[PDB]
Amino acid sequence: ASEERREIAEVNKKLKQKNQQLKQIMDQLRNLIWDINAMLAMRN
């Protein structure tokens, strides 16, 4: 149905928008795990 396809698009848009929230998390979580190791490995 045409209307059903519209709801899927709305779900995809919400899921796609939620994915954008998720990608920033990894970059932040990734960045932190990067930074901690670089700071520590150099420890004296």
């Binding site: 929230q21 998720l22 920033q24 932040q28 932190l32 930074d35 700071m39």
Partner: protein, 57 residues
């Protein structure tokens, strides 16, 4: 007078080193420095929490 005279006798033989080189610095500098590393974790953990607080909406 005797008590002070005792100190000078006390000082004469056991003390009177000209300089001192204790140098308690390699720990002080790296302690606050370690705290700064811990502080860097503070803000960025909070930023993550804010970022995934947006996940909840």
């Amino acid at each position: 007078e005797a008590e002070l005279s005792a100190q000078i006798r006390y000082l004469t033989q056991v003390a009177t080193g000209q300089p001192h080189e204790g140098s308690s610095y390699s720990s002080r500098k790296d302690c606050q420095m370690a705290l700064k590393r811990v502080d860097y974790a503070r803000l960025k953990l909070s930023d993550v929490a804010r970022t995934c607080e947006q996940m909840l909406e």
